[PDB]
Symmetry: D2
Subunit: 469 residues, 4 copies
């Protein structure tokens, strides 16, 4: 047999069912079709493309040792490149993994019909998901918009398997079509600025496996009390690796459940909730693929926004005057990642405080986030605008005085990303516009020149939001 594997966002060799199907039957021809025209509005952002350039290099380096290597093709049409690979490789079967974004859903089915009619067999295995969105029903069949009612039933009867990495790898003697090597992801006018994200990130499937041993045996023990704290990479940093499919979610769920069974047996209650807080976070990634599968284009709510370009640039540069918002936008753009509670605040500020279009705030998240996912990002904005009964309503404006006192105690997250407020005490570190002048100047801050004043008064933004509902 001659099989052609099609890597998309399953950039790994471990537990790859499409790759395990190959190399178990005949020869393998790895290929990566990169068609930017067919991506549409879902084109990968600036930082998301940088992770793709490094992961594909780490992938091609991995496949180069197994026996074959990793063909990259930039084409104007995916089917035009797939049918052209079969021309030079003489393959009789093509295999790939599942992707549930709106562009790949209609493309996986179109690629099927075009070459299955031609006597060439296809097969699409389960990838990046523990449960397919067509494997669960409420007995009846109603969709569980309730994540609580969703994940409560997913914990019942797991029936899958964990695969292996292929020991060997065979490749036919072929030619080339239309081939490329490495271009179309990083712009020369910003490569030096993009080469600085390596300070806190290292793309690759093997580096992802090092992270699992760094988090399971050492950091998952007290994850329930660290995830609440926002200052420190307190969580697992597995979002960029899981999006690009560098870690199989089977492994992320198996070894985490393995720790839960040991802690549930050792009477340990601190680790039990730590495993619950992490496994029920893994289910949210599965919940995002379930909603986006039967609720694509939910969020059909177009109320009078306030398309102010200048007020949007201050939200990107962290000049909104709010400490917890400006620090989050400072962390997002410095490391390409931010905590979940930070995203909740900086996104709510973009729609509830500034009335900017939610698409504008998402297009910036889609561009600068290293973990820029499609199902998870949309799911986060639905949690903000009030599209799920298990999320905060659009009308509420959380007071930063108590909001910072929950996720960022002692104000150590602002004093790390906003060094100008390093002497402002924790009593006013989340809201300098409430402290008297006798303690503001004592802290060294001068609201106006030393630190930006609040861009929008919260007292006037509460009623003005309810003034249009």
């Amino acid at each position: 047999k001659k099989t052609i594997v099609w890597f998309r966002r399953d950039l790994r060799i471990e537990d790859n069912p499409a790759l395990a199907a190959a190399a178990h039957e005949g020869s393998v021809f790895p290929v990566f079709i990169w068609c930017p025209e067919e991506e549409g509005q879902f084109y990968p952002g600036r930082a998301s493309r940088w992770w793709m350039k490094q992961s594909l290099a780490h992938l091609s380096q991995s496949l180069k040792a197994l026996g074959s290597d990793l063909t990259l093709i930039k084409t104007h049409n995916t089917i035009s490149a797939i049918l052209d690979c079969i021309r030079v490789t003489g393959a009789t079967k093509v295999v790939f993994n599942h992707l549930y974004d709106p562009v790949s859903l209609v493309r996986d089915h179109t690629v099927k019909e075009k070459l299955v009619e031609r006597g060439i067999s296809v097969q699409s295995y389960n990838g990046d998901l523990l449960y397919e969105p067509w494997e669960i029903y409420c007995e009846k069949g109603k969709p569980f918009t309730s994540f609580n009612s969703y994940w409560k039933k997913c914990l019942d009867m797991s029936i899958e398997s964990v695969m292996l990495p292929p020991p060997w790898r065979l490749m036919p003697i072929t030619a080339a079509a239309e081939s490329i090597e490495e271009l179309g992801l990083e712009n020369e006018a910003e490569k030096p600025s993009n080469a600085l994200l390596t300070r806190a990130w290292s793309p690759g499937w093997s580096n992802a496996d090092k992270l699992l041993n760094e988090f399971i045996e050492k950091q998952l023990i007290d994850y329930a009390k660290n995830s609440k704290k926002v200052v420190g990479n307190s969580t697992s940093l597995l979002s960029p690796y899981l999006h690009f499919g560098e870690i199989s979610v089977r492994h992320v769920f198996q070894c985490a459940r393995m720790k839960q069974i040991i802690w549930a047996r050792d009477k340990n209650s601190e680790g039990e909730e730590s495993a619950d807080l992490f496994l029920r976070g893994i289910g949210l990634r599965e919940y995002s693929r379930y909603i986006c599968f039967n609720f694509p284009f939910s969020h059909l709510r177009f109320f009078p926004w306030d398309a102010d370009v200048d007020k949007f640039k201050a939200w990107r540069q962290g000049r909104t005057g709010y400490p917890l918002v400006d620090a989050g936008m400072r962390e997002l753009w410095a490391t390409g990642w931010m905590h979940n509670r930070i995203r909740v605040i900086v996104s709510s500020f973009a729609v509830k405080f500034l009335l900017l279009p939610w698409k504008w705030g998402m297009k910036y998240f889609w561009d600068t986030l290293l973990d820029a996912d499609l199902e998870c990002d949309i799911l986060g904005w639905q949690y903000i605008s009030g599209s799920i009964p298990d999320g905060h309503e659009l009308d509420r404006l959380d007071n930063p005085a108590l909001q910072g006192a929950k996720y960022d105690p002692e104000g150590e997250y602002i004093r790390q990303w906003l060094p100008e407020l390093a002497r402002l005490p924790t009593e006013w570190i989340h809201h300098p516009w409430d402290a008297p002048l006798t303690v503001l100047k004592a802290s060294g801050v001068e609201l106006g020149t030393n630190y930006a004043k609040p861009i929008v008064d919260i007292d006037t933004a509460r009623e003005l939001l309810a003034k249009a509902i």
Copy 2:
């Protein structure tokens, strides 16, 4: 559908095909039927029974945290106990894993025939092996008889898979049948002495996975450089955990295979070589079940006039033979229930070629003392030492303890730990004090014949008493 899971030597949940097959179809019913009379001359030993008692107690607490308890059963007939569990729970399928011991080889295929007549569904799975002995074929007849030619063909193709542990399980209902209250595995007079085995061993599958993680990440880096030595944690110390099936062979194999792949793209020239020896070490266990399958007795039927000396037999157990590697090996074997591989090639070659003692005498001692008392490994180990297999050693091959210790134990640090009386004896004579001059022996406070015993047998006599005893 109610399904009875029959635990035997697969005391684990991570990759248990029989346990994963059940608990997914419907209900589950764990049971450990302990029938000592059906196991003949190779009834589980003394220390190995102690390990089994602690693992079963840990297995009981592990399963009770998932959903169902564990039915500990000690009856007079195993098949009678299986038929008793079917009627009390209403089960319809009996599921267990594969075992290749001659006792279970003839009764596992008997339980199937007994239950097919009654209509009870049965299905066996490969639990503690990656290549079953009937899966490797050729185009001719017989196996390979050489491990090099056997393991060369196993590395050609590979189709494995790792199963997941179920987070939920369901008990059946009503009354229980004959139930054993965890009894028989220990004798009242030798219980405090068996508790001393906890100093270097913590049985159970939970500590088994942590050791596999510790060895792969922090010790497989230089396994090829330490496995050839004896001192300290030279190897992985996974034999007692792999014998009772607490870690699946695939989980141990793939962890060193995954680490070997990363040690290739990073051009770790000596890294992937360390995984080659460890994986081939696992292959020796695979090759043990191939010989034991085709040759199902206990290529080893050479019993000639032995020196049935019970006085020289107790001097070999307690480690008082004048040979440091032999004495220190028998000192660690009885104090920790374990010993290095190269030392087992020494203490047993000394038992059959230096003392002319029966090989069944030393093998019965390994059965009671070794926690990793593997039937398939304890047979292949003694066959490799004698001239039974052309895999390595012959019958008329003796090794000088001088070049033997300096090859597997430099600086003599292994003897000084288990023989304090030879602490100030230099490494040049630490492995053979009799060949050292009296000017250094008294300076090293040895004094043969009072503190450390003189060599019980001469190296030249054992060669002249054996070459003239073969015809």
Copy 3:
């Protein structure tokens, strides 16, 4: 014998000559006279006073466990308080250590003259200093105007022992006089802002002993290669404890000297150089007291200034547009300490770029430095203004491009204290105004809104100095 141990800036118990001589004689009455009126402009600043309140509280409970409590007195005249402590205790002798500042020099000699005439014996010992300035002279009595010829001579002689803390203690047990528990150091208008210095500093003498045992066996090995690094606290962080006398320099020298002898015969060509740069640095504290002794006020090289108050606020708040200067002024305000290389840059920028009075720059250093030392700070400004033969010429300015490449490699000091310059490459991390406009957006740095433009051009400031000399 009833003795009075006048604690001043010797806030320790171990290696205390005046405390040991008074203990091994008879009774001990420790007292601390705090007269802010006798202090001229050398009155302790905001940060330096906070360190005094913590060390004195630690000193109070320290002696409280040995046998005698600590007495703090805030009076109008020090001699009036000393005469009061004598008439309430009957102490026939008053002992103290040495202080070489101009105010405390004429005071100790006035205290001796006023107490000797009353029949009360006085005794002074060497404290907080290896060898006094009146003990180092060649065959000629010429004071060493150069430091290279200074410390090279201090190593050719060594005669000073080290003593242990007193074992026992007892009190003359008599009524007290005017007993000012704790007044003057901290005002309530800035108490919470001052309490935030506990993040990176823990004042006390036992914490100083905790600091040495960590710096010797762990950080002194490669001190020569870490002193060239500005990022982080690469040095020892011993200046605050040495200024307040919380640990004697004899123990600081003896621990580093024996480590050098250990590395001497060990063929350690890297440990000797590390012990050298630390001991040569200890000599700078020794050299500061030498110039402060027979050179009262040289630093009288004044030149016309441009005292711009608005340009002085930007120098404090770090709004000067220079990344290496603003990052240092942020660290000076956040933690009250900065590296020696940073102090050279931020002080030269105040006098050589903005043309601000050197006293104004010192008035801010003296107020915000936890290690605010009179002899060390003046010696620092003498090194910048060009008042030393082996210093820096006042007529020349260093290019921040090559300046950052010398003391801040990899560019990690700006990315920590100025998070807006995170993705700005090292090629322009020290000077964003030289970078092209194409990379100023790739680095997400808009000068008019993100990080302010340089307030004064470098080439103009270099010629403006030559325009008035």
Copy 4:
């Protein structure tokens, strides 16, 4: 000036009063005069001489790094070698540190008189003790009888200090006196066996400052609860280093003293008690040189012994059937060191259970111990003998069933030095003879085959000694 330094038992530089004073006055000419014929009975043993050789070359290496060598001299008369060094060097003052052995007490003072009559300046400093034995005066004239009352007197003054190492060194011109390159400390027959002491000891003043800092900062907080134990590094292993004067007694005292002050205000509870035991442990060394100073050569009893040469070989090589005694003898000979609580067990077993002459035990402890202190080893045997008031009477001995139940619980100390008793339960581990026959067959213990039977009954030693105490 030019001063000659005489290193004898002060092989250190951190705090050496005779070395730092000689460095300031002028030139430094370090000499190490040995002369075994003047030692006689107090000649260092086999293992103790090995430490002296390794610590000598290491101290000679550290001296040359400063600027002055170390002249090693082996002579027949120590005074003839001192005068030979003065003429070839031209020195004026001869300096050295104090010692408190009967040899040096009459030798150093003889050096003083013969060099004073010739016009050579001499000055001896204190560098081996906190308070010198003549600085303490008690009652009216009885030099105190016990230690618990002696050390209370030392805790009522304390005018100590410490000194710094001198970075400068300069040796004069020509010399070449009657110095040898290597003496006769090691014999070729016992050299490879002596090299096996490096695995447990790294002698020298440089390493001495390492485990000193390691002990005070790490394993001192819980010294009050680990001093009674024996397993592992229970104590500080500072006995051999303080014997050769590689660490100043003031630095050892003032380090644990500084931790007690910090643990006082913080109220560490166990911290103050651990210092109160370690400092009073140093006080026993202070009392060792005190009782040995006023008394010559309280330990002179020649009652009928049992001079059995075969019973001496069993107690020496650890074959007496007593695991707590046999394991100690196998440690004392393997590592050249043993815990203090083991010494009162292996030495009391030799003089009471076996009735062997105590000189046979003291001669063996002098050869195999690296910390062979003349002033301290004698006091240890006096504690075993019925001599010291606060000590063991001659007719007292404890059952090992209670010794291990308090000083060595869990029996992990025996299973390391006696592997043949590993599976023996921790109850009968210190006395296998009293164990039932079922546990002995189960624990592989065959008293008389693999492990030796008790060489002497405990009830016999009590009844045999009663007839001799009349």
